[PDB]
């Protein structure tokens, strides 16, 4: 399943200095980008528009523009009312997935609200001042109707357009390569195993152990580094039709 995630970061230094930057991921692939220094949402793949028309897409272009400027000023004004202190960080994570949707908002890196049903609701562990913000946001009937239309109708119709358009790149397979090394000793030693240059993301590497994090390469391929304190290294992956990558020490 390939969820579509739309991310936003809005930073407020003082009441004069602010920035808002955004992005969209389709599964692991990033399909859009949108910076503060730009009056448009930028497409990244030749299929980023999916099965939407130019007129359809341009309408989306017009909505986001109005929203970015309004969001900014709504937040500066909320700052006075709620007497909050600068700096302020706000983040938004919105989207859906074709089989339900979502729209979460965070402040200083903690959840505060979200868009359920037809309106805004707080999160279980939120401050009292959030009640004031929820009370005001829920007055704008047109915005509440517009977020519903966007999540219930526009997003799901959009994601499909993408899936029948980016079927090559999504169902693509890249083979990894692998090698061993000797790190810094803890008379103990450290056996490090390096697996790099694979795609898609789901992978499997063990010593047959500290299986490291999956780290990104700049060509949308991935990288992994599992270690052991003290023998073989084995890697499974979809690209390897059962035939695993066994490297011996």
């Amino acid at each position: 399943l390939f969820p579509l995630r739309c991310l936003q970061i809005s930073s407020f230094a003082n009441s004069s200095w602010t920035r808002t930057d955004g992005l969209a991921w389709l599964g692991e692939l990033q399909t859009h980008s949108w910076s503060n220094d730009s009056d448009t949402v930028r497409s990244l793949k030749p299929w980023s528009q999916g099965t939407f028309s130019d007129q359809q897409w341009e309408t989306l272009q017009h909505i986001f523009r109005v929203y970015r400027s309004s969001f900014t000023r709504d937040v500066k004004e909320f700052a006075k009312m709620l007497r909050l202190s600068y700096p302020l960080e706000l983040q938004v994570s919105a989207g859906c997935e074709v089989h339900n949707n979502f729209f979460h908002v965070a402040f200083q890196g903690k959840d505060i609200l979200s868009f359920q049903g037809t309106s805004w609701e707080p999160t279980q562990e939120a401050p009292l001042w959030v009640n004031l913000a929820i009370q005001v946001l829920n007055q704008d009937k047109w915005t509440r109707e517009t977020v519903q239309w966007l999540l219930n109708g526009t997003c799901p119709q959009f994601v499909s357009g993408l899936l029948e358009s980016g079927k090559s790149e999504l169902k693509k397979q890249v083979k990894p390569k692998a090698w061993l090394s000797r790190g810094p000793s803890p008379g103990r030693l450290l056996l490090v195993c390096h697996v790099s240059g694979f795609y898609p993301k789901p992978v499997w590497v063990k010593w047959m152990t500290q299986p490291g994090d999956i780290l990104p390469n700049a060509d949308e391929t991935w990288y992994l580094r599992a270690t052991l304190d003290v023998l073989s290294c084995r890697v499974k992956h979809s690209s390897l039709e059962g035939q695993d990558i066994v490297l011996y020490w």
Partner: T-cell receptor
Amino acid sequence: DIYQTPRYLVIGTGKKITLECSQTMGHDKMYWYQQDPGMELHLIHYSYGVNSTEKGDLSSESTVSRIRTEHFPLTLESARPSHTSQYLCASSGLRDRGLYEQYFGPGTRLTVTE
Amino acid sequence: QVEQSPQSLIILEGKNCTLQCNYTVSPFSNLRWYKQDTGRGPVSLTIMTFSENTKSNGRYTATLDADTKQSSLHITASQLSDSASYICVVSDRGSTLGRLYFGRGTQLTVWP
């Protein structure tokens, strides 16, 4: 349902002045405008609720207080002759349709003499 | 941000008139027309959103063309009690979080 007392007011120069405004509904949002005869309304103060007191689109020597929802008093620290004007109070709330209308008080006329 | 026209005008009773209001406010939520008698508070006449092109409150009738950002107030069968100041204000949000923009008003004198 929005009240302003008194309706008229004479006072001497250099003394303090307080202007009453009250509303029997429960509207949070409230505004103070100052309007010179034969001219426009200028916002001088407003409030989003109790303990909220923001300066408006005009720099007056006045101050407001919102310690109670229903009352929004305007106060002149030390009155000068140039404070002679008309002062209107107002509020915002949900009404006949599904929108937030603004309702104005009747107003108060202040004359400051020497 | 919000303009009205004319500044003032003088008509005789029994005649119709039309008052203009132009705005550059974006984004747009709704627009109201107020009537202010000398030495009194303004009185709500009408409020309109973009999805409406007409509203009538008694002898008063407001239209709103959202596409050219203009609304006009039309007084039918004027009389001496229509002498007042007529104000038009625009709001840029559908909540109390908005900003209100006022016109300088229009003074209307009605003679016998």
